Assembly symmetry: D3
Homo-oligomer: 97 residues x 6
């Protein structure tokens, strides 16, 4: 067990508990199509952290071509990092239909 | 704007705030390389949600070739959903090196 | 100052912080009308707590004429309390229009 | 299901989980009078958001005459909003006895 | 830096943020003595974790002579751990005076 | 029941729920030595709040000689408070072996 692993654990557990808590309440109210549509993209987004000189800190793979920057945080980070939140373009494509 | 977008916005802001707060406190103590290392995989993990009949709810594209399941939640979800948290196998490979 | 006041203070600050943070991020993307619409009913919902013998614990004045129960929690509370979350029926009426 | 509804859901669930978690711990320790007195006003407070020109964004009804501003947030919101947290005057009247 | 250190850092930052936020809101309303009184024991409580075989997991030095168990959690932990929250008996002594 | 007690309750419950949630996930994955080593010092750290004139607001006892300042917050508090987070020196001594 390492710090990196414990940090991943904390994100995972955040998401697990949110998903389970939500379902406990919404299952009767929303249809299956509704709840499944709600969770389709949940958690799929990631932050690309770019350092102050343009060097990407976040590990990325070839997938990135199919992702779209949805939200941006700039000028807030004390090391001059830029944070971009990227989600599947497929989500926007399905919304448009 | 939609509910889905707002949900994405909530995950985004959670991670933007976490990253910026941490950097504010750790900046002095850790080296840039140490913080970069800390954030290399931060937020790259995602959940794969499977319903009780084995049908995947989460959008999936590409392959899980280079992914590994870090954590699983089963038996907790009201709908019988299984939740798996997947991360880059590269992270684990790099821990070896 | 009392415990009750401090509890009220905690709910207050939670909502003040949520509103201000959201506005900070969404300001650019959404129109003022869109954000106003988003916040029209934000925090107007309240809980009505009923004990296991049907006696209401929450202060109530006025009438529930123009309220609707949006969400209920039963069978979870250690004391056998039932919890109902009530919101303005106007919100739902306006969703129709 | 809409964004507005999901947002209400998030407030409701916050309150439900807090109330139930608290009761799980305090029921043995506090008397019934104690815990019921603690929850009498819990969640009844709301924020009145006023825009930068004096126009109230929050929906309000006639009830407002029986409410009292307990806490105020000003100069923090990036759209120049003023946030006022209002609770039943009845709470202050009962404290004074 | 280690996982243990990072965990300590997370508890630290939680309390730093809580203290500073509260002071920001309560500063005007309460007197310095009132806020000082509020924070006299804030964060001095600690948990003692005992495994199912009665062996203490938490580091302990000194004595519990002048401590009191304020809250206990049993029967909830997957490993059969018992959790006790210990605070200065002085706090309770001062509430009498 | 007083505000001070309710505030202690909130810290206690935060820690209890974190410890139990973590164990629910990590017990299978980490060894007993691992999880027990993780929790050895958890919650043992405290904040020493010093007012703007050098007067310590936090109650402290003789124990303090065996504690070490791990993290510091300065210049953020609106009353000019200094916050120092102190942990057992024993933790650092065990890390070094
Ligand atoms: K992700
Ligand atoms: K309310
Ligand atoms: K502590």
């Amino acid at each position: 067990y390492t710090m990196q692993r414990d940090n991943q654990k904390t994100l995972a557990v955040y998401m697990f508990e949110e998903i389970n808590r939500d379902v406990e309440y919404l299952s009767g109210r929303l249809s299956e199509k509704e709840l499944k549509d709600k969770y389709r993209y949940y958690g799929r987004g990631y932050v690309r952290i770019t350092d102050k000189d343009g060097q990407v800190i976040t590990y990325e793979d070839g997938s990135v071509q199919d992702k779209t920057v949805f939200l941006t945080n700039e000028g807030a980070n004390k090391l001059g990092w830029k944070l971009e939140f990227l989600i599947d373009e497929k989500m926007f494509e399905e919304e448009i239909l």
